[PDB]
Design an enzyme around this catalytic site. Structure first.
Site, PDB file in Angstrom:
ATOM      1  N   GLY A   1      49.273  33.908  61.237  1.00  0.00           N
ATOM      2  CA  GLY A   1      49.653  34.048  62.635  1.00  0.00           C
ATOM      3  C   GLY A   1      50.470  32.862  63.103  1.00  0.00           C
TER       4      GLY A   1
ATOM      5  CE  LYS B   1      44.050  32.242  62.840  1.00  0.00           C
ATOM      6  NZ  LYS B   1      43.047  32.185  61.751  1.00  0.00           N
TER       7      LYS B   1
ATOM      8  CG  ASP C   1      40.474  32.971  52.526  1.00  0.00           C
ATOM      9  OD1 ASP C   1      41.244  33.045  53.513  1.00  0.00           O
ATOM     10  OD2 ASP C   1      40.877  32.757  51.357  1.00  0.00           O
TER      11      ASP C   1
ATOM     12  NE  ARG D   1      44.476  30.465  51.395  1.00  0.00           N
ATOM     13  CZ  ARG D   1      44.018  30.729  50.172  1.00  0.00           C
ATOM     14  NH1 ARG D   1      44.391  29.984  49.139  1.00  0.00           N
ATOM     15  NH2 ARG D   1      43.194  31.749  49.972  1.00  0.00           N
ATOM     16  CG  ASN D   2      41.543  28.754  54.384  1.00  0.00           C
ATOM     17  OD1 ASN D   2      42.450  28.910  55.202  1.00  0.00           O
ATOM     18  ND2 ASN D   2      41.332  29.632  53.433  1.00  0.00           N
TER      19      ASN D   2
ATOM     20  CG  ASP E   1      41.457  31.410  57.831  1.00  0.00           C
ATOM     21  OD1 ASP E   1      41.091  32.357  58.558  1.00  0.00           O
ATOM     22  OD2 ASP E   1      42.563  31.388  57.252  1.00  0.00           O
TER      23      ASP E   1
END
Ligand SMILES: CC[C@H](C)n1nc(N2CC(C(C)(C)O)C2)c2cnc(Nc3ccnc(-c4cnn(S(=O)(=O)C5CC5)c4)n3)cc21
Length: 300
Positions: A29, A50, A139, A143-144, A157
């Site tokens: 997003g 976000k 997940d 990256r998270n 996330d």
């Protein structure tokens, strides 16, 4: 049944958010940098905003809001509140150093064994908390993981969190859509590999459709050059076929903590210790007045 979730969902006024600028955009997003100036409180909170106007987009983000508002741990990202506009926006803490994946890539030349091993303890602590709260992240990846300070990281996330990232997924998850805390342990091992390789892409060039075959044959991510057999053996244990044979997050906290007490014994980095990363006791780290971090701004 289960325990009543008495977490508070804070509806925040649009008029309380100033100095908005884009941090990043993608499949995730749009995330904006902003300042939350509540009531007549004399506080300016640095925030991240976000957004994914579609009814299905509002459904998915409110599911993430639900999970993110229910968590409270120093190594997990908590929802500050939501703003009801044209699209539903999540208001979260600004992590000045961004995600850990881009951090390890951009600061490779100054990242030492102590920092790498501490990040492993911290990710395992946050993950153990999610296990206590009976949450399966589904997940976990480098990256998270967001960087508050080089010495303090947090997991985020919660878009997939419950009570497709093939290359991070446990084989049971690829073949049978089975997710457990032990499937998160597999993703943790991949996250650790990503850190130890200074942000290398797992199974680079290999298509997602080939991964299940690769894992079934017995292939695993290779041993990073800086990793001793001690560190790699932990990664391998996270990638066992039998989920119950994989370590528990409480064991990963213990294992990495012992290692972090003598980091040069477990990670071999050229020019180690001398490597320095910005600390809160250093110059130009931080109107400026009335600025309060979300971790120090409690309730209304
Ligand atoms: C993760 C990438 C996202 C765009 N992002 N980028 C940041 N800035 C880069 C900037 C510089 C250049 C100065 O380093 C720092 C940054 C700061 N705070 C938060 N804050 C939070 C807090 C809690 N959760 C989230 C969150 C939740 N989902 N996502 S995501 O979908 O963007 C994630 C998969 C990338 C972020 N963000 C998020 C931030």
């Amino acid at each position: 049944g289960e325990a009543p979730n008495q977490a508070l969902l804070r509806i925040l006024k649009e008029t309380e958010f100033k100095k908005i600028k884009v941090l990043g955009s993608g499949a995730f997003g749009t995330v904006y940098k902003g300042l939350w100036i509540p009531e007549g409180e004399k506080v300016k909170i640095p925030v991240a905003i976000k957004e994914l106007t579609s009814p299905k987009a509002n459904k998915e983000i409110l599911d993430e809001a639900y999970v993110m508002a229910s968590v409270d741990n120093p190594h997990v990202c908590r929802l500050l509140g939501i703003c009801l506009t044209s699209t539903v926006q999540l208001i979260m803490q600004l992590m000045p150093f961004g995600c850990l994946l881009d951090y390890v890539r951009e600061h490779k030349d100054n990242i030492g064994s102590q920092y790498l091993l501490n990040w492993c303890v911290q990710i395992a602590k946050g993950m153990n908390y999610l296990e206590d709260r009976r949450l399966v992240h589904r997940d976990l990846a480098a990256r998270n993981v967001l960087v508050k300070t080089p010495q303090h990281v947090k997991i985020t996330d919660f878009g997939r969190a419950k009570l497709v990232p093939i290359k991070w997924m446990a084989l049971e998850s690829i073949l049978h859509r089975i997710y457990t805390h032990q499937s998160d342990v597999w993703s943790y091992g991949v996250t650790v590999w990503e850190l130890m390789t200074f942000g290398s892409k797992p199974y680079d060039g290999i298509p997602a459709s080939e991964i299940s075959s690769i894992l079934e044959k017995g292939e695993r991510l290779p041993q990073p050059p800086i990793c001793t057999i001690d560190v790699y053996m932990i990664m391998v244990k996270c990638w066992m076929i039998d989920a119950d044979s994989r370590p528990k997050f409480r064991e990963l906290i213990i294992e990495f903590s012992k290692m972090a007490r003598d980091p040069q014994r477990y990670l071999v980095i050229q020019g180690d210790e001398r490597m320095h990363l910005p600390s809160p006791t250093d110059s130009n780290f931080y109107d400026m007045d009335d600025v309060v971090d979300a971790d120090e701004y409690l309730i209304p």
